[PDB]
Design a protein around this ligand. Structure first.
Ligand SMILES: *[C@H]1O[C@H](CO)[C@@H](O[C@@H]2O[C@H](CO)[C@@H](O)[C@H](O)[C@H]2NC(C)=O)[C@H](O)[C@H]1NC(C)=O
Ligand SMILES: *[C@@H]1O[C@H](CO)[C@@H](O)[C@H](O)[C@H]1NC(C)=O
Ligand SMILES: [Ca+2]
Ligand SMILES: [Ca+2]
Length: 534
């Protein structure tokens, strides 16, 4: 029943789910297959007239989270699962995966001009799909609030398929294919969203974790120019756990190391042109070769095998430098974190039990760090188990003498303190920040990484007041305070400002606090950011 006429005249049919209308699996680019592998996406040319879009398309190829060149049980276990016909049945994946989804309130018609929330999923830049992020909770809530919004989600290439790097990739100008897929998705929204009832000038981009870092990348894309056909692609952004990516250039050391390993794994180690050889292997071969490179749950943890890297063209330089240099789009933003962002990643190195092994693990993870810098880090983040994450849990959660320490470090560099650095240098627009402690007391993990996804798409909780209501108000009025919350959300100007500047969330509800914790780690970590890039 639900129908829409795209900008090229094609008329498409959606699915009436009653609580909302959906248009799932719309292709926005040609299959990045064959010789199009690793290359910039190409706008879809085919006609869609008369076609129905009532179900999510396949996700892009996924990399085993426990993938690694080594051989262990976790890897073998996940592999066994991810290759089962049952798994490929419930969660299909393919290289032909560049589709987009539009879900709106029931009865919404063309010209409605409702604000648009364009979701970018996160998954360590190695796994992920749009189908596992239900928009119903957000949509229904926005309606009950009298601020109906349209939910748009875009698939993009992950892992070796979307973030392959190295000298060859750089020379080709094919860096950051995954981010480019997202960018094309945004342009597709600009040209066609009006047909679904959305207002292209009211697009707010939001994502969590890898999706959150993606949002940051879009703010810094092309040195800040986020225009398309003379108009901005988005008027605001919401970053849920993830700011700048601490990475070396695309043709850096680890970028090349990984590219060579992958090529060897695929049997292209003797090709004079390794890139063309990789475009020649079958899907299976590439999938297998990729699963033999470190995944995000493997020992390498945060030192990701695949992720956004400055290319000198679309991301002109060091990302922390781009922010200091003011090379970004000027939009209002909301950026927050979960209290214990790093506990998940800390479970990947439970073989590290002594300070000496901890120091060694850090030296391996951050190759640019000098011994002095490492000593400083280990002083800012002491062995004292009562001081690590899960924070404020005393002697509890001591899986090892180093677990809470490694969890704290990884959590801060990758997300929590990285956020403060951005907030302390960004003058692009009004800034709002939150810190969730909604799950204080949860054994081992605490208020863990990605728990907000549950309270935003699956279950209702104190945090839903922020992940839903506040976010909907922001996308609608550009001020979270129009949501009508009992606690006023203060504006963030500086981590050094007096008065509360953080919206806080506990199990009972909301309150405000200050972004002034672990200042020693902040300095030890960001005096010279590049010393800790991967
Ligand atoms: C704890 O486990 C990790 C994971 O295997 C060990 O790291 C690997 O060690 C082997 C043997 O030397 C190497 O071949 C691999 O290259 C290492 N993996 C990576 C990605 O570095 C680590 O040495 C162990 N640490 C301690 C303190 O026992
Ligand atoms: C990549 O950067 C170049 C440099 O100007 C630009 O021409 C091109 O449009 C950029 N690609 C995208 C997706 O914006
Ligand atoms: Ca090489
Ligand atoms: Ca500027």
């Amino acid at each position: 029943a639900p129908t829409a006429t795209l900008a090229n005249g094609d008329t498409i049919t959606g699915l009436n789910a009653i609580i909302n209308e959906a248009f799932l699996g719309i292709p926005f680019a040609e299959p990045p297959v064959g010789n199009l592998r690793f290359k910039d996406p190409v706008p879809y040319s085919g006609s869609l007239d008369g076609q129905k879009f009532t179900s999510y398309g396949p996700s892009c190829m996924q990399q085993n989270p426990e993938g690694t060149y080594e051989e262990n049980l976790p890897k073998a276990a996940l592999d066994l699962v991810m290759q089962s016909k049952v798994f490929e049945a419930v969660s299909p994946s393919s290289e032909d995966c560049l589709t987009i989804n539009v879900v709106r309130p029931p009865g919404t018609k063309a010209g409605a001009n409702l604000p648009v929330m364009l979701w970018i999923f996160g998954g360590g830049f190695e796994v992920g799909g749009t189908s596992t992020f239900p928009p119903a909770q957000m949509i229904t809530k926005s309606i009950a609030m009298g601020k109906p919004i349209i939910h748009v989600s875009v698939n993009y290439r992950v892992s070796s398929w979307g973030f392959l790097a190295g000298d060859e990739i750089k020379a080709e100008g094919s860096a950051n294919a995954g981010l480019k897929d997202q960018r094309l998705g945004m342009q597709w929204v600009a040209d066609n969203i009006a047909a679904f009832g959305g207002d292209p000038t009211k697009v707010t981009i939001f994502g969590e974790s890898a999706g959150s870092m993606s949002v940051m990348c879009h703010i810094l894309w092309n040195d800040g120019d986020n225009t398309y056909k003379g108009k901005p692609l988005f008027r605001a952004g919401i970053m849920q756990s993830g700011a700048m990516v601490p990475s070396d250039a695309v043709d850096g050391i680890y970028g090349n190391e990984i590219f060579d390993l992958l090529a060897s794994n695929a049997g292209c180690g003797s090709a004079s042109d390794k890139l063309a050889c990789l475009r020649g292997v079958s899907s299976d071969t590439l999938e297998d070769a990729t699963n033999n490179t470190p995944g995000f749950l493997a020992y390498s943890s945060l030192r990701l095998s695949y992720l956004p890297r400055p290319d000198g063209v679309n991301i002109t330089d060091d990302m922390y430098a781009l922010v200091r240099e003011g090379k970004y789009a000027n939009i209002p933003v909301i950026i927050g974190d979960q209290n214990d962002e790093g506990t998940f990643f800390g479970t990947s190195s439970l073989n590290v039990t002594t300070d000496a092994q901890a120091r060694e693990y850090f030296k391996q993870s951050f190759v640019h760090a000098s011994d002095a810098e490492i000593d400083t880090l280990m002083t800012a983040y002491p062995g004292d188990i009562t001081q690590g994450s899960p924070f404020d849990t005393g002697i509890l959660n001591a899986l090892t003498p180093q677990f809470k320490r490694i969890s704290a470090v990884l959590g801060d560099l990758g997300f929590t303190l990285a956020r403060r650095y951005f907030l302390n240098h960004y003058t692009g627009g009004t800034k709002y920040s939150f810190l969730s402690k909604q799950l204080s007391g949860l054994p081992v993990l605490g208020t863990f990484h990605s728990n907000d996804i549950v309270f935003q798409d699956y279950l209702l909780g104190s945090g839903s007041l922020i992940y839903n209501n506040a976010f909907i108000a922001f996308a609608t009025d550009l001020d979270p305070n129009t949501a009508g919350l009992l606690v006023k959300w203060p504006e963030y100007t500086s981590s050094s400002q007096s008065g509360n500047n953080l919206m806080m969330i506990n199990a009972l509800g909301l309150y405000t606090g200050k972004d002034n914790f672990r200042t020693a780690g902040y300095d030890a970590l960001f005096s010279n950011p590049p010393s800790f890039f991967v």
